[PDB]
Amino acid sequence: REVALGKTVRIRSAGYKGQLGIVKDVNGDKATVELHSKNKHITIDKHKLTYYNREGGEGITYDELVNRRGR
């Protein structure tokens, strides 16, 4: 019942800053996120990457726990 499942996200910091992907699997503090331009899968901390809307809009941090929705 993880909120970070099937949501469009953007990776901040590290070497993949600005990349766009969709979360696929969550393993504890680490989550597997695919990439749009690159055909590869990377695992990073779920608390790091930001969260966007499926259609498109503003981005927010991991504060989505208090609001079980998108955006």
Partner 1 sequence: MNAPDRFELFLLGEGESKLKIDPDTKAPNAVVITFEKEDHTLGNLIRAELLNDRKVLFAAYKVEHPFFARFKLRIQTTEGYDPKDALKNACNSIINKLGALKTNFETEWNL
Partner 2 sequence: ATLKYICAECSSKLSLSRTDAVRCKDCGHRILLKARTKRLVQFEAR
Partner 3 sequence: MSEEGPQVKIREASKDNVDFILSNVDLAMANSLRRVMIAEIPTLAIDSVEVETNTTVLADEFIAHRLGLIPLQSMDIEQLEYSRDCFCEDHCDKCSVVLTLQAFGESESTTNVYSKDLVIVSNLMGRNIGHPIIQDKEGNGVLICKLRKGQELKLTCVAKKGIAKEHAKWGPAAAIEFEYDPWNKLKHTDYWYEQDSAKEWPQSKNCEYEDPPNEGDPFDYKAQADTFYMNVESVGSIPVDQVVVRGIDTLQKKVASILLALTQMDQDKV
Residues contributing to the site for partner 3 (CB under 8 A): 10, 12-15, 17-18, 37, 50, 59
> Residues 29, 47: contact at Cβ < 8 Å?
yes
Task: Establish if 24 lies at the interface with partner 2 (CB under 8 A).
Answer: no
In what side-by-side order are the strands of the sheet with 30-34? 41-45, 30-34, 20-27, 8-10, 50-51
Task: Establish if 63 lies at the interface with partner 2 (CB under 8 A).
Answer: no
> Residues 59, 49: contact at Cβ < 8 Å?
no
| Partner whose footprint covers residue 40, from partner 1, partner 3, partner 2, none (CB < 5 to 8 Å by kind) | partner 1
Interface with partner 2 by CB under 8 A: which range of 23-31, 34-42, 43-51, 63-71? 34-42
